[PDB]
Amino acid sequence: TFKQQKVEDFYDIGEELGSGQFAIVKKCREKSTGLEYAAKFIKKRQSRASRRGVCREEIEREVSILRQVLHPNIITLHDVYENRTDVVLILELVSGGELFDFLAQKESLSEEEATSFIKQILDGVNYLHTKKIAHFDLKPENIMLLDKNIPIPHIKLIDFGLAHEIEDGVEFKNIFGTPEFVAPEIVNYEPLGLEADMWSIGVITYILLSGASPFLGDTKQETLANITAVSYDFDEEFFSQTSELAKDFIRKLLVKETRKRLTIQEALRHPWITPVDTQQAMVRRESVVNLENFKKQYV
Amino acid sequence: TFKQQKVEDFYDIGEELGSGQFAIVKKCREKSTGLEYAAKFIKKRQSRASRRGVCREEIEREVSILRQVLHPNIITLHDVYENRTDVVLILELVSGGELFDFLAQKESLSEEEATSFIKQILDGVNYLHTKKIAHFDLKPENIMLLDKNIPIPHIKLIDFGLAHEIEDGVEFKNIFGTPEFVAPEIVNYEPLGLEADMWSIGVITYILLSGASPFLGDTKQETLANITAVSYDFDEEFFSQTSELAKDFIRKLLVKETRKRLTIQEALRHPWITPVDTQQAMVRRESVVNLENFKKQYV
Ligand SMILES: [Ca+2]
Numbered sequence: 001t002f003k004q005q006k007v008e009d010f011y012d013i014g015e016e017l018g019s020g021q022f023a024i025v026k027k028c029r030e031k032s033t034g035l036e037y038a039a040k041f042i043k044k045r046q047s048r049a050s051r052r053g054v055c056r057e058e059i060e061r062e063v064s065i066l067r068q069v070l071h072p073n074i075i076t077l078h079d080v081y082e083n084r085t086d087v088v089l090i091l092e093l094v095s096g097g098e099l100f101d102f103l104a105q106k107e108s109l110s111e112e113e114a115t116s117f118i119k120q121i122l123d124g125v126n127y128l129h130t131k132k133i134a135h136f137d138l139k140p141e142n143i144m145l146l147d148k149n150i151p152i153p154h155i156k157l158i159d160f161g162l163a164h165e166i167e168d169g170v171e172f173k174n175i176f177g178t179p180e181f182v183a184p185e186i187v188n189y190e191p192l193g194l195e196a197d198m199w200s201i202g203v204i205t206y207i208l209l210s211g212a213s214p215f216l217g218d219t220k221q222e223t224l225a226n227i228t229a230v231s232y233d234f235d236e237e238f239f240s241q242t243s244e245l246a247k248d249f250i251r252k253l254l255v256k257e258t259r260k261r262l263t264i265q266e267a268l269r270h271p272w273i274t275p276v277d278t279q280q281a282m283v284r285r286e287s288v289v290n291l292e293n294f295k296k297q298y299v
Numbered sequence: 300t301f302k303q304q305k306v307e308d309f310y311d312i313g314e315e316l317g318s319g320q321f322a323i324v325k326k327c328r329e330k331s332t333g334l335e336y337a338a339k340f341i342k343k344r345q346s347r348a349s350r351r352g353v354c355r356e357e358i359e360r361e362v363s364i365l366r367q368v369l370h371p372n373i374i375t376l377h378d379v380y381e382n383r384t385d386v387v388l389i390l391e392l393v394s395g396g397e398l399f400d401f402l403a404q405k406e407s408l409s410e411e412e413a414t415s416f417i418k419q420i421l422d423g424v425n426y427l428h429t430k431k432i433a434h435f436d437l438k439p440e441n442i443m444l445l446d447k448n449i450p451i452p453h454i455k456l457i458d459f460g461l462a463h464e465i466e467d468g469v470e471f472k473n474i475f476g477t478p479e480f481v482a483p484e485i486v487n488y489e490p491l492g493l494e495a496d497m498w499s500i501g502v503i504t505y506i507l508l509s510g511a512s513p514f515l516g517d518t519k520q521e522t523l524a525n526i527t528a529v530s531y532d533f534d535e536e537f538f539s540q541t542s543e544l545a546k547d548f549i550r551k552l553l554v555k556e557t558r559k560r561l562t563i564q565e566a567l568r569h570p571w572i573t574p575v576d577t578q579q580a581m582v583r584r585e586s587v588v589n590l591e592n593f594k595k596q597y598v
Contacts, residue, residue: 048515049479049596055518174520175474175486180348187474189487189523216347219354221473224488297348
């Protein structure tokens with residue numbers, strides 16, 4: 001159930017935080033408490049054939065999933081309102097900007113520091129996967145920071161518009177997501193599961209370390225072909241300062257066969273995320289991110 | 300190659316006619332002639348990773364295809380300008396609005412009259428397929444009229460944003476288009492050809508006669524499933540006045556196997572389009588379009 005009231009009776013609506021093509025997000029403040037939040041206005045789809053808005057069934061799904069999740073690295077749902085046109089989700093305010101845009105301003109970044117941000121993401125996704133929840137839209141712009149003005153920023157995974165609970169012995173197939181970041185089973189219209197998220201993590205890791213994107217072609221047709229042929233390389237132009245541990249981590253994620261891809265638990269336990277001896281920790285410490293190419297590709 | 304000049308040096312730019320995600324159209328008039336056209340501004344994509352704009356390569360392809368086609372049922376290109384941000388296609392002015400919107404305002408409509416509009420579409424597609432051009436975006440909003448105010452409106456296929464030349468021995472695969480109208484090979488990411496256009500015609504015919512949509516589900520996920528298993532029917536609620544010839548036409552278009560689907564020439568020869576005896580033509584004349592459900596689903 002959604003509250004059948006005028007949201008603006010209870011919240012002062014403020015400046016825009018961004019706007020997808022299916023939602024508009026704005027700062028707000030609950031009048032009764034004075035606490036700040038984000039108000040995510042979702043336009044309800046008015047007809048079955050319509051390409052505008054979202055069908056209330058999928059909004060309900062997003063809400064149902066948000067309600068199950070409480071974790072430091074996952075956006076927190078506060079409330080839901082509804083009128084004739086929109087459903088409005090009141091969500092924890094995540095104002096710190098994107099992770100990538102924080103990194104783009106660093107003057108130095110080691111793999112050690114890099115892995116510490118990546119672990120925050122793995123913690124969030126581990127939590128969802130344990131609850132059998134697939135995010136299905138992991139990509140830099142859904143990786144945000146609470147506050148970009150503290151020494152080590154806190155990551156929050158946002159936007160559960162495509163998230164889905166995965167049911168055993170129940171097949172889920174659909175096509176969606178940003179081509180650059182989708183797993184081969186999405187392009188190939190094959191059974192989807194928690195594995196797609198793991199693929200995305202590899203692609204995001206690849207970009208964070210190097211500035212390059214593994215499968216991105218000159219056109220979408222090219223991107224999809226690269227994905228499905230699992231066609232990519234570790235160009236020395238961009239990867240010459242990247243550790244073998246890093247590449248091994250990536251290599252084990254960018255795999256077509258869903259059952260051979262590292263799970264979230266295995267990713268957390270990979271030596272590049274969780275060194276098992278001093279030697280590995282030193283190597284990681286001595287490997288640097290390609291800030292120069294990273295900054296360049298992301299501006 | 301595109302004229303590297305300021306479009307408005309040569310045209311008076313008028314009112315906005317329409318706009319999509321990747322183009323905006325304004326009415327215009329060439330100064331030297333006084334003749335009117337439509338100026339289609341297409342924003343150039345500025346980076347490979349960017350999701351905004353169209354890459355020049357695909358704009359070139361669209362232009363390249365339009366320059367090859369002169370046929371009374373196909374929009375006719377006049378010129379192309381280019382500036383810093385945009386490529387501007389100067390195109391024949393098609394002002395009569397959408398075919399569907401005109402049908403929806405109709406009092407009565409027989410299958411004989413319906414096949415008359417469908418034939419116009421088949422003529423345009425036949426011309427295209429002869430030249431090995433696949434349109435790849437056959438759907439209602441891309442089927443316009445020159446003048447809705449004459450007894451028998453003149454149909455014009457528009458929007459070659461997705462059109463592609465099909466090369467023998469060259470595999471083309473991609474994912475695109477409107478879910479309601481895409482063939483199974485698009486959804487399954489299989490080799491694409493001229494056959495996809497024939498599927499689309501099937502769907503459009505289904506809708507035109509009945510007002511209902513063969514594969515339309517409650518969500519995209521469902522639409523994609525229906526398409527792939529070719530799951531549809533002729534609900535008597537809507538098809539009770541529709542001839543067996545019409546349904547046979549649709550049946551032979553909505554087939555999964557690309558090799559068994561009717562080609563464009565076979566469509567053109569189908570008895571529902573091209574009756575061989577007085578008996579068939581009577582039946583057509585006596586079967587009525589479901590204007591009532593049609594108006595409802597589209598207006
Ligand atoms: Ca497939």
